[PDB]
């Protein structure tokens, strides 16, 4: 009766999706053929009369080299072949190419296939969209997809996982150019949107997980465990549950602010888990530590105005409220004066499961925190300076102009974003 549709764009979204759907099949006991060797899978797996289950995810890309390994690997038979949309010529790290030139050739096919999936679901609970701020497919094609989706579907929740560009390291040179013209689109076409910095996970895996040499698979396992705690209340009953409509209302005070920070805890190896007792009061402390966020910004510079908690496993509501009380007594963490009770709590019974060859260990209680913070203006002011020094003498502007978009859209995004930076400054002033 509840159903969610997954949307994965770009090479990062595909690789995240393969790691997510590995976790999902092992969590629900699904063989790679697609058949089990009691109805919690109805939100994610469509039902076939023969007994097979087909996921409700659409993998899209504009380069065949990423989708080819999906059609070749272990899960080649599990996925429906029409769900893996592949283009011919990629935008190649250009927002203008992915928005105005290339994306319109396959925008008919992906919007047709999303209608076939939405036909099978009686009641839609939300569209999960995985996307990257850096690459052209995750920036250009994603931008006009929501612009079409905002008028195609009216009020249906579209939850977002952004790949925010790194402040100090980089894959691309034009990645600040891509990561700005999408902010205009995601203001009025995104319901909620989480973000991530890559080197923060690099710091977490290096320091906490005792892995001195990780890969993108090791990051995608930690991202997938963040995803699963959100939908855990949808698929498993608890003492009190939380839905997609529930936590999206209690964390946005204004439509211009829908950018919170997620933080997972505990993250630990199987060696240190043998040493440390993991109580609920001890795992909730790791969500406030400045070294343990997944976001490369310190909330001590800012102040909290909305917080969401996702507890999973052997958890007791008394020790949750006891641990919430003692954090409120601590004066290191600060809250806004206009929101005295900024907490929201979710409880699930089932402990999180782990995959063989993974990084983490089996745990009996875990916590995910969704906290809105003023400190994302810190990272944006750092990135705003990087954008306009590049744009001071018109670097790389000939590539975007020649695709078909006019030259005024760059300054149009700048005077938009300067207003949003001023918006967050006046939210945090005390009354």
């Amino acid at each position: 009766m509840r159903e969610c549709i997954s949307i994965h764009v770009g090479q990062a979204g595909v690789q995240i999706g393969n790691a997510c759907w590995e976790l999902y099949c092992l969590e629900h006991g699904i063989q790679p053929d697609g058949q089990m060797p009691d109805d919690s899978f109805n939100t994610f797996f469509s039902e076939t009369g023969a007994g097979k289950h087909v996921p409700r995810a659409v993998f899209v890309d504009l380069e065949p080299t990423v989708i080819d390994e999906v059609r070749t690997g272990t899960y080649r038979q599990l996925f429906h072949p029409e769900q893996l949309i592949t283009g011919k010529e990629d935008a190649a790290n250009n927002y203008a190419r992915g928005h105005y030139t290339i994306g319109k050739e396959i925008i008919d096919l992906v919007l047709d296939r999303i209608r076939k999936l939405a036909d099978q679901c009686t009641g839609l609970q939300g569209f999960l969209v995985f996307h990257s701020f850096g690459g052209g497919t995750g920036s250009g094609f994603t931008s006009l997809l929501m612009e079409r989706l905002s008028v195609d579907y009216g009020k249906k929740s579209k939850l977002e996982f952004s790949i925010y560009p790194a402040p100090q390291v980089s894959t691309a040179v034009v990645e600040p150019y891509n990561s700005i013209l999408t902010t205009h689109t995601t203001l009025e076409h995104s319901d909620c949107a989480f973000m991530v910095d890559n080197e923060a996970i690099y710091d977490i895996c290096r320091r906490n997980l005792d892995i001195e040499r990780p890969t993108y698979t090791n990051l995608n396992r930690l991202i997938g465990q963040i995803v699963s705690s959100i939908t855990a209340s949808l698929r498993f009953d608890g003492a009190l549950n939380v839905d997609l409509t529930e936590f999206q209302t209690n964390l946005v005070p204004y439509p211009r602010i829908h950018f919170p920070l997620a933080t997972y805890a505990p993250v630990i190896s199987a060696e240190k888990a043998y040493h440390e007792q993991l109580s609920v009061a001890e795992i909730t402390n790791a969500c406030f530590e400045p070294a343990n966020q997944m976001v490369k910004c310190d909330p001590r510079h800012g102040k909290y105005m909305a917080c969401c908690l996702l507890y999973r496993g052997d958890v007791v509501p008394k020790d949750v409220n006891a641990a919430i009380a003692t954090i409120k007594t601590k004066r290191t963490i600060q809250f806004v004066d206009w929101c005295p009770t900024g907490f929201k709590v979710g409880i699930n019974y089932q402990p999180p499961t782990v995959v063989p060859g993974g990084d983490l260990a089996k745990v009996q209680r875990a916590v995910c925190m969704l906290s809105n913070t003023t400190a994302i203006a810190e990272a944006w002011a750092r990135l705003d300076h990087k954008f306009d020094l590049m744009y001071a003498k018109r670097a790389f502007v000939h590539w975007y102009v020649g695709e078909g978009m006019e030259e005024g859209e760059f300054s149009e995004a700048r005077e938009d974003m300067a207003a949003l930076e001023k918006d967050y400054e006046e939210v945090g002033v005390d009354s």
Binding site: Q11, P64, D68, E89, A92, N94
Partner: protein, 426 residues
């Protein structure tokens, strides 16, 4: 799917391509007869990028050869890997140029252009979605430079929205094996700057520099030189054929390499070059790649970027590795040397990762770097051109064949504007 059509111009391009076609046929497992003989299923699905399909499961390359002298065609055809190309792909002329730019561009360029255009259209129309072309030529002789400029200055107007790569052998001061080579170099670069997407500057002095200092080869013949050139020209476009954790097509490199349409001259580099004696002593590790590759000796251009500034940086890696160290080492070398990098582009480095290693190695690296140190080589060609032209050197070979004297002046005026354009970023 995405296909690259290969061009060879002059004796230099033919010998470079002949070694290059030997390298990647061994990379894709192709015997001299043409039979696929492979040990992995991964070598076959991406073959159409460079090969065709024939009866009986043969593969022929998508290459066409341009030359004005058949004295190199018979050696190319009688080589160990000369039996694979189709005989119609060979194009030969009966009257050569004679190391003269004028012969291949004005008089004898008009007669041979129809045949090479006919064969390239007949093989490019078979592509379901053409990705781009590829050229190899030398600036030291008019056979590959007189034609190589006129073919480019025609096929752009035929195919405007395509990507064009060429490898230019820039003439050298100590490899000055031609009296009229400034005239060949300067008047080709004038045509090269306004009508090319991608250019690579390879120098024979720096090719001699590696074999004397690094490889310690006693007799480094031109086969060993083309081995070094094919090593970086195969590894630049690995992502078209082999998937990785972070793929990057040549279009994806190009859009981040040029911030302006005229800044398209780069300095390629290859990391894993070690002598026989030091191969046992050296270790293969991720910082070992970037240490050797950012060494100023390992370039194949005859100008050191220490005098200039790193404008934009790219690196394409090969092999299975954890790449936290890849991002760690690039940030370390960017922040340690804060004077060699331009201030108005932070995070100057492109990064690509390919899972499939080069044959016989765990790991490798390929470097593409744009800098203002190329204005050294342009001004050294310009000073030798203006030293010859003011006494009107070799005028009767050039003026009497059908051009005015003002074509030299506008070429110098354009090239002076090139040097002044590259100066403002330093």
């Amino acid at each position: 799917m995405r296909e690259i059509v290969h061009l060879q111009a002059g004796q230099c391009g033919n010998q470079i391509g002949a070694k290059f076609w030997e390298v990647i046929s061994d990379e894709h497992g192709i015997d001299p007869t043409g039979t696929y003989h492979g040990d992995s299923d991964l070598q076959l699905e991406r073959i159409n990028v460079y090969y065709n399909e024939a009866t009986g499961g043969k593969y022929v390359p998508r290459a066409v050869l341009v030359d004005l002298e058949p004295g190199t065609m018979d050696s190319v055809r009688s080589g160990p890997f000369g039996q694979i190309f189709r005989p119609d792909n060979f194009v030969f002329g009966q009257s050569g140029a004679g190391n003269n730019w004028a012969k291949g561009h004005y008089t004898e360029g008009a007669e041979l252009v129809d045949s090479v255009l006919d064969v390239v259209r007949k093989e490019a129309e078979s592509c379901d979605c053409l990705q781009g072309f590829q050229l190899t030529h030398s600036l030291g002789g008019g056979t590959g430079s007189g034609m190589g400029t006129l073919l480019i200055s025609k096929i752009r107007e035929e195919y405007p929205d395509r990507i064009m790569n060429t490898f230019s052998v820039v003439p050298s001061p100590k490899v000055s094996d031609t009296v009229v080579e400034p005239y060949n170099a300067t008047l080709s670069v004038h045509q090269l700057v306004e009508n090319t997407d991608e250019t690579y500057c390879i120098d024979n002095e720096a090719l001699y520099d590696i074999c004397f200092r690094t490889l310690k080869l006693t007799t480094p013949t031109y086969g060993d030189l083309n081995h070094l050139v094919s090593a970086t020209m195969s590894g630049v476009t690995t992502c078209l054929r082999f998937p990785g954790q972070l793929n990057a097509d040549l279009r994806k490199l190009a859009v981040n390499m040029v911030p302006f349409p005229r800044l398209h001259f780069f300095m390629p580099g290859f990391a894993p070059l070690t002598s026989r004696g030091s191969q046992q002593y050296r270790a293969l590790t991720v910082p070992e790649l970037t240490q050797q590759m950012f060494d100023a000796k390992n370039m194949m251009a005859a100008c050191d970027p220490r005098h200039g500034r790193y404008l934009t940086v790219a690196a394409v890696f090969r092999g299975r590795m954890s790449m936290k160290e890849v991002d760690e080492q690039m940030l370390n070398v960017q922040n340690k040397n804060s004077s060699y990098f331009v201030e108005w582009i932070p995070n100057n480095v492109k990064t690509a990762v390919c899972d499939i290693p080069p044959r016989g190695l765990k790991m490798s690296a390929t470097f593409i770097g744009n800098s203002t140190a190329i204005q050294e080589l342009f001004k050294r060609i310009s000073e030798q051109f203006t030293a010859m032209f003011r006494r009107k050197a070799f005028l009767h070979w050039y003026t009497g064949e059908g051009m005015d004297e003002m074509e030299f002046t506008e070429a110098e005026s354009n090239m002076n504007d090139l040097v002044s354009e590259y100066q403002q970023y330093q």
